[PDB]
UniProtKB/TrEMBL annotation, chain A:
It is found in: Host cytoplasm; Virion. This is Genome polyprotein. It comes from Human enterovirus 71 (EV71). Component of immature procapsids, which is cleaved into capsid proteins VP4 and VP2 after maturation. Allows the capsid to remain inactive before the maturation step. Interacts with capsid protein VP1 and capsid protein VP3 to form heterotrimeric protomers. Belongs to the picornaviruses polyprotein family.
TrEMBL record, chains B, D, E:
Interacts with capsid protein VP1 and capsid protein VP3 to form heterotrimeric protomers. GO terms for cellular component: host cell cytoplasm; viral capsid. The chain holds residues 100 to 318 of 862 of the full protein. Lies on the inner surface of the capsid shell. After binding to the host receptor, the capsid undergoes conformational changes. Capsid protein VP4 is released, Capsid protein VP1 N-terminus is externalized, and together, they shape a pore in the host membrane through which the viral genome is translocated into the host cell cytoplasm. Its main location: host cell. This is Genome polyprotein. Belongs to the picornaviruses polyprotein family. GO terms for biological process: symbiont genome entry into host cell via pore formation in plasma membrane; symbiont-mediated suppression of host gene expression; virion attachment to host cell. It is found in: Host cytoplasm; Virion. It comes from the Viruses. The keyword DNA-binding does not apply. Keywords: Capsid protein, Eukaryotic host gene expression shutoff by virus, Eukaryotic host translation shutoff by virus, Host cytoplasm, Host gene expression shutoff by virus, Host-virus interaction, Lipoprotein, Magnesium, Myristate, Pore-mediated penetration of viral genome into host cell, T=pseudo3 icosahedral capsid protein, Viral attachment to host cell, Viral penetration into host cytoplasm, Virion, Virus entry into host cell. Transmembrane segments: none annotated.
UniProtKB/TrEMBL annotation, chain C:
GO terms for cellular component: host cell; virion component. The chain holds residues 75 to 293 of 297 of the full protein. Its main location: host cell. It is found in: Host cytoplasm; Virion. The lineage of its organism: Viruses, Riboviria, Orthornavirae, Pisuviricota, Pisoniviricetes. This is Genome polyprotein. Keywords: Capsid protein, Host cytoplasm, Host-virus interaction, Lipoprotein, Myristate, T=pseudo3 icosahedral capsid protein, Viral attachment to host cell, Virion, Virus entry into host cell. GO terms for biological process: symbiont entry into host cell; virion attachment to host cell. Residues 1-172 form the Picornavirus capsid VP1 domain.
């Protein structure tokens, strides 16, 4: 999260296993696997995708609470997604 | 943590309800337990397909406010919180995971004063002191088990004791988040 | 400290119900019959107590007459008498007491009747909303022993005292005026502060 | 500290360059090492009067921003950072202790994506998290020694990933300070 | 009991399907597993809301016939029992907890002889010898887990080898009861 230090709020990061459709709302988005991310306290969170192979999983991000900011701080912020692989990722069949 | 009545619930994940937007004209909100969780989730799937039920709860309330907002919230659990109308409708009596707005927060829709709620398990949410309030309530009833659909054990009341204040330009709505995790839940009588 | 115990707080038998026989009457047991005792009992959510009932019968002028009376207690679930010759009067399972008006007032004890583990004054649910089902103590029926009509008008007063009171889950005390015996609703338009006011 | 590639430089004071004013329209800056220190200082006096040279570096980057500014900076060292023009001029190829502005920060003037720079020794400068970023880079080359005037070991890239934002009335320019201290420096061939 | 392929299933109640009325003109029936249990029960509630799945089975077949009825039934499990049409429809390919009738029991809707089914885990139901046949099948697949909705592990075939015979006056229909209990079931990927 790349907002002002005085900016606060919550956001829902839900992961849906393969096959599952996009949730219709936050009510069913919370029922699955999710993390509740508040950026007033912690500025960076990690979501671990359980397992993938070559249907694929879905990752959606929801506004748990509105964006609350004080007077004099910018009214828009940005989120940067950094993705990686765990220690158990492997590849096979090299192809150009 | 506040352990309600000094007893830990005896003989299971976090549920996040819709955020409530605290404003200058807000009076208060109340949620009926466990009716708040019956309609949603795997927990509520057992409630509607079982006869009997018993469980504690772990209610956690958070407010996301900056340093330029002020106000105080009184969060408290009231066992057997019966509504008194000016009979209540169904939507007012057992509101789902969306609560209801108190029309008369002074008497709390029950003819009892707001000033005396501190006799119940409670915590204060003061925006300049803390933003968290967690209450651990055990199972309270005259019988070991009870129907989850026709009876509400207690009602979680969240009332703005002092109005929210802010300068023009700041965010006029303060979201209130409640995360409740059933603890020591039991079920019986699969229907 | 011994003054503020529950037993001392809920002792001191108070008049619950008065019965007029100007030839029988039913009086369902209700603690709320004592006018100032509802607000005292609502301060907790659960109760468990045994009651002692005293029946002081006399004429409307307070004069004592030589008449025989029968007060029968029908436990919860039993049918009530519908007339002065109903078969419910002779039933053995409804305990009775035969006392003359000259003898000292009858004094009987009724134990904890509820099938639950406590008397609960607020039901946040349906068995019609707020109808606490298992709070019914029973019923007291009064009639003059005899087949013909009695020669005197009678007034029967009932005094009830709780012993062995236990309480649970304290709650804020009522501040608004009561409107109905069963549900706790108030008058919204005529809402009043808890106490008096001032100017500054 | 981030030790570049896990190796401490093996076999000497702080130098402060000109502050760079980070703005709403800023794209990024890059400094060529050790060419950034050749023109200035006692260190640069040895570089221009010697044949061979080897040294590590200790780059420290700071941003002076208040709590009402927001933005993120990616500081990273890229060994052998060659420029790709839309041949480059001398001023663009080896800018002195004044850096150069990236015209195309997406491709980084080299046809390589900005998104993948995290494979290099780097740190994040998030204005709401921290204002400091220090990277310890060793000597990286195919030969033990190299000319300091005709060859740049690596290029320090500082790029605004998220634009600087502020309310009107706050200071519109955020100064960026870089303090670099040569470590384990060696020289040979006094000319 | 017949343990299929000599292995007990490794790493949960009885389900009773509809009775099948065996007659003089009956040809045979087949059930697809675990598709037979997907549509019904708590087991089938997990199958339709999970991605992966693995489980053995404990199939028990019973016939209620008197001493004046005669006939023989061959019950056998055939892993990966693919249908061959004279493409199959969905109802024929994956029939629910109601099976399907073989139009050509000689080739078994797959171009393979009925005479050779004894190479598979099987039991004989001879009305003058026994009325029970229980087969314990493990999990058989090329992968540890598989989709329960798009793939059937095996197909339980029950074919009258010798026609049912009886005297006129006796009951002309012999009910066939199949009771299957999942064993060592596993699920993953809650969707």
């Amino acid at each position: 999260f790349t907002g002002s230090f005085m900016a606060t709020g919550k956001m829902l990061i839900a992961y849906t296993p393969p096959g599952g459709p996009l949730p219709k709302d936050r009510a069913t988005a919370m029922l699955g696997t999710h993390v509740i991310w508040d950026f007033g306290l912690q500025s960076s969170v990690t979501l671990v995708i359980p397992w993938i192979s070559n249907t694929t999983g879905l990752v959606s991000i929801w506004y748990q609470t509105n964006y609350v900011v004080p007077i004099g701080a910018p009214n828009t912020a940005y989120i940067i997604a950094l993705a990686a692989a765990q220690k158990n990722f492997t590849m096979k069949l090299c192809k150009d | 943590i506040i352990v309600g009545y000094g007893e830990w619930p005896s003989y299971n994940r976090f549920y996040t309800l819709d955020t409530k937007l605290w404003e200058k004209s807000s009076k208060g909100w109340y949620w009926k337990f466990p009716d708040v969780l019956t309609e949603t989730g795997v927990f509520g799937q057992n409630a509607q397909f079982h006869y009997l039920y018993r469980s504690g709860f772990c209610i956690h309330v958070q407010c996301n406010a900056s340093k330029f907002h002020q106000g105080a919230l009184l969060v408290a659990v009231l066992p057997e919180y019966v509504i008194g109308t000016v009979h209540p409708p169904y939507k007012q009596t057992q509101p789902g995971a969306d609560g209801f707005e108190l029309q008369h927060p002074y008497v709390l829709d029950a003819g009892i004063p707001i000033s005396q709620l501190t006799v119940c398990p409670h915590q204060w949410i003061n925006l300049r002191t803390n933003n968290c309030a967690t209450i651990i309530v055990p199972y309270i009833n005259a019988l070991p088990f009870d129907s989850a659909l026709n009876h509400c054990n207690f009602g979680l009341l969240v009332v703005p004791i002092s109005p929210l204040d802010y300068d023009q330009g700041a965010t006029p709505v303060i979201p209130i988040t409640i995360t409740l995790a059933p603890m020591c839940s039991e079920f019986a009588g699969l229907r | 400290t011994a003054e503020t115990t529950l037993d001392s707080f809920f002792s001191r038998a108070g008049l619950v119900g008065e019965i007029d026989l100007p030839g029988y009457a039913n009086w369902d047991i209700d603690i709320t019959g004592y006018a100032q005792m509802r607000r005292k009992v609502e301060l907790f959510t659960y109760m468990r107590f045994d009651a002692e009932f005293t029946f002081v019968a006399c004429t409307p002028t307070g004069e004592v007459v030589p008449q025989l009376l029968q007060y029968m207690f029908v436990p919860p679930g039993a049918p009530k008498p519908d007339s002065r010759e109903s078969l419910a009067w002779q039933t053995a399972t409804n305990p009775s007491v035969f006392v003359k008006l000259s003898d000292p007032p009858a004094q009987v004890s009724v134990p904890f009747m509820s099938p639950a583990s406590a008397y609960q004054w607020f039901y946040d649910g349906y068995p019609e909303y707020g109808a606490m089902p298992n709070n019914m103590m029973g019923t007291f029926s009064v009639r003059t022993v005899g087949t013909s009509k009695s020669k005197y008008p009678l007034v029967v007063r009932i005094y009830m005292r709780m012993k062995h009171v236990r309480a649970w889950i304290p709650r804020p005390m009522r501040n608004q005026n009561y409107l109905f015996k069963a549900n706790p609703n108030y008058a919204g338009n005529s809402i009043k502060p808890t106490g008096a006011s001032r100017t500054a």
